[PDB]
Curated annotation (Swiss-Prot), chain B:
Record protein name field: Spike protein S2
Top-rank taxon, per record: Viruses
Source organism of this protein record: Severe acute respiratory syndrome coronavirus 2
Result of altering N218K: In strain: Omicron/BA.1, Omicron/BA.2, Omicron/BA.2.12.1, Omicron/BA.2.75, Omicron/BA.4, Omicron/BA.5, Omicron/BQ.1.1, Omicron/XBB.1.5, Omicron/EG.5.1
Effect in UniProt of substituting S231A: In strain: Alpha/B.1.1.7
Region feature (Heptad repeat 1): 169-219
Substitution effect: T108N: In strain: Lambda/C.37
Purpose of the protein: Precursor of the fusion protein processed in the biosynthesis of the S protein and the formation of virus particle. Mediates fusion of the virion and cellular membranes by functioning as a class I viral fusion protein. Contains two viral fusion peptides that are unmasked after cleavage. The S2/S2' cleavage occurs during virus entry at the cell membrane by host TMPRSS2 or during endocytosis by host CSTL.
Glycosylation sites: N76
């Protein structure tokens, strides 16, 4: 029910150890979202899925197929 | 070196203009929605500084991390990759950049949405993608490629035939390693290199210090201390004196918010440039003459700095 | 060509579905409408303010009072309404500079993405740019950026050069790759393996210098034609 | 590199180009075929 963020004291938001994309920003890496029983949860935001590229001095990856993507700007 | 964001501010214009005086607050209501539109403008600036930062650093969809074995064909990225020795894993060069760059009146500073550690995880991801996969992580999935073969693609991209790399690879690696060494000497010795970021710190500090000092000004009232007017005078005359302080303090805020809106447009122009150098210099290989440093451009590495980004072109 | 046409036609279908389902997708244009509307509503609501006069309504001052006092009351409304306008016009000048910076970008995306094909990474959408189509929108432009995305990776062993008869061979365009036992040269952005030959490679120097050079035969298409 | 039929292309003749120079161009097929 109470959570000291670096942005200030946050009250009524449930602190969570899991991490998600930033739904509502709060500051200093904290975000909050309404989730399931429902509550406003608050969490340290995820920056993206973590990945290790399969690098070595003699391995290459080459695309065997493609997709045409139409994107709107 | 490029500015990307500036210190986010929130100003309680009721506490700036009046502060605890309910007599002044009831006069300030007669000026209408000036106080909500000042807060709206500073909030638009403040939310934009998080967008400016997101547009520059969040160009990578997945947080790439480098392999445990650093078999990059003689190129030594250790000064620009994350340092495990540190509590927050900035690179060695990012720590040089973070060392070179250095109230009650309703004025406050809001924190950035991304911590300096999250900015460093993005420069780590951009750099680990760039080293392990060339431009490919910008176009789609990161495709591994050996770094000597990636640099042979970078050489073909400048019209130098790729055998000129493989037949000189130890020389090219030693020149790159030496050139990264000269960056550490430059950033250790010469603080004036970061002046473009330090000026963004100085301008925003000077603007708040000027906004504070303008509370001491009378604007033609009998005193600038609002409790002098309310202790010495009575409402039929005190309101005439307080309207001079309200008018001058409201004009002092409109001056600050106007120059912060103009300064935010200058920072956004720099953040859109830095986001374009991230896409074209880091995620690609720009043909654009002098866009990614003076010379035929091979590749660029992003490093974080306070309120900015630093490209090692 | 049939696969590429079907992927393009499918991707254009997803644009109609995205726009039809997701009215928030045009948020850049709707925010520019909302900001200019909120600026006018703020400018109009500021006529209801007293600014220290006896009334916000100028005809109260002109009906109730006479010039020796009425000009003192009106000059407060003039001072506040003129400050209300100078604030609006200043924020419209700054917002007009933001829209001009966006219109210069849109004019540059017209020239480089529509009238051309752009080598500039992520300038004309994510992936390698093929072409873009302009569509009009209220107070804006929409670009439908068609891009090639490389989409089904396979890992291969690779080499910078191939040793033949002492000479080091490098690919003219593409890379050497192996399926595990045989060596091929392929273009970089799509796996299309070909036999390594004196035609699709060039020599420079010998097997001593290159780090990680690998031994494989290089086929010479003149040889079986000339000797047999 | 040696000037050859592999690293050069023909167009037209000696009359048109301002500043053209006489030099032998090696054809790699010729000695290979004559061997």
């Amino acid at each position: 029910n109470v959570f000291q963020t670096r942005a200030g004291c946050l009250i009524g938001a449930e602190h969570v150890n899991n991490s998600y994309e930033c739904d509502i920003p709060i500051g200093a890496g904290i975000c909050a979202s309404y989730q399931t029983s429902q509550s406003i949860i608050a969490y340290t935001m995820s920056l993206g899925a973590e990945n290790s590229v399969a690098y070595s001095n003699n391995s290459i990856a080459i695309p065997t197929n493609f997709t045409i993507s139409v994107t709107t700007e | 070196i490029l500015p990307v964001s500036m210190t986010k501010t929130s100003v309680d214009c009721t506490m700036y203009i009046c502060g605890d005086s309910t007599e002044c607050s009831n006069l300030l209501l007669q000026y209408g929605s000036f106080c909500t539109q000042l807060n709206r403008a500073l909030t638009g600036i403040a939310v934009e500084q998080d967008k400016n930062t997101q547009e520059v650093f969040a160009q990578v969809k997945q947080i790439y991390k480098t392999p445990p074995i650093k078999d990059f064909g003689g190129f030594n990225f250790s000064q620009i990759l994350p340092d495990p020795s540190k509590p927050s894993k900035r690179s060695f060069i990012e720590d040089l950049l973070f060392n070179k760059v250095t109230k009650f009146n309703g004025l406050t500073v809001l924190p950035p949405l991304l911590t300096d550690e999250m900015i460093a995880q993005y420069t780590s991801a951009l750099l680990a993608g760039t080293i392990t996969s060339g431009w490919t992580f910008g176009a789609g999935a990161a495709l591994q490629i050996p770094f000597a073969m990636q640099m042979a693609y970078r050489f073909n991209g400048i019209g130098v035939t790729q055998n000129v790399l493989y037949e000189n690879q130890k020389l090219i690696a030693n020149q790159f390693n030496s050139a990264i060494g000269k960056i550490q000497d430059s950033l250790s010795s010469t603080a004036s290199a970061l002046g473009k970021l330090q000026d963004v710190v100085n301008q925003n500090a000077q603007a708040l210090n000027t906004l504070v000092k303008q509370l001491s000004s009378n604007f033609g009232a009998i005193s600038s201390v609002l409790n002098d007017i309310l202790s010495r005078l009575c409402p039929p005359e005190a309101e005439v004196q307080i309207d001079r302080l309200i008018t001058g303090r409201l004009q002092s805020l409109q001056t600050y918010v106007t120059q912060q809106l103009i300064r935010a447009a200058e920072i956004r122009a720099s953040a859109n440039l830095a986001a374009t150098k991230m896409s074209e210099c880091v995620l690609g290989q720009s043909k654009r003459v002098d866009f990614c440093g003076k010379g035929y451009h091979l590749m660029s590495f992003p490093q974080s700095a306070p309120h900015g980004v630093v490209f090692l072109h | 060509q049939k696969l590429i046409a079907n992927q393009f036609n499918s991707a254009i279908g997803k644009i109609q579905d995205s726009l039809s389902s997701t009215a928030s997708a045009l948020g850049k244009l709707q925010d520019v409408v909302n900001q200019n509307a909120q600026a006018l509503n703020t400018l109009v609501k500021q006529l209801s303010s007293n600014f220290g006069a006896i009334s916000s309504v100028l005809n109260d001052i002109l009906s109730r009072l006479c010039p020796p006092e009425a000009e003192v009351q009106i000059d407060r409304l003039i001072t506040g309404r003129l400050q209300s306008l100078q604030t609006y016009v200043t924020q419209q000048l700054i917002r007009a500079a933001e829209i001009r910076a966006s219109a210069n970008l849109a004019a540059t995306k017209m020239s480089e993405c529509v009238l051309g094909q752009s080598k500039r990474v992520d300038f004309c959408g994510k992936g390698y740019h093929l072409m873009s189509f302009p569509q009009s929108a209220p107070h804006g432009v929409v670009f439908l950026h068609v891009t090639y995305v490389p989409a089904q990776e396979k890992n291969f062993t690779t080499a910078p050069a191939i040793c033949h008869d002492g000479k080091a061979h490098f690919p003219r365009e593409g890379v050497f790759v192996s399926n595990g036992t045989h060596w091929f040269v392929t273009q970089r952005n799509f796996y299309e393996p070909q036999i390594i030959t004196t035609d699709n490679t060039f020599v420079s120097g010998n097997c001593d210098v290159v780090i990680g050079i690998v031994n494989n035969t290089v086929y010479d298409p003149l040889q079986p034609e000339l000797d047999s």
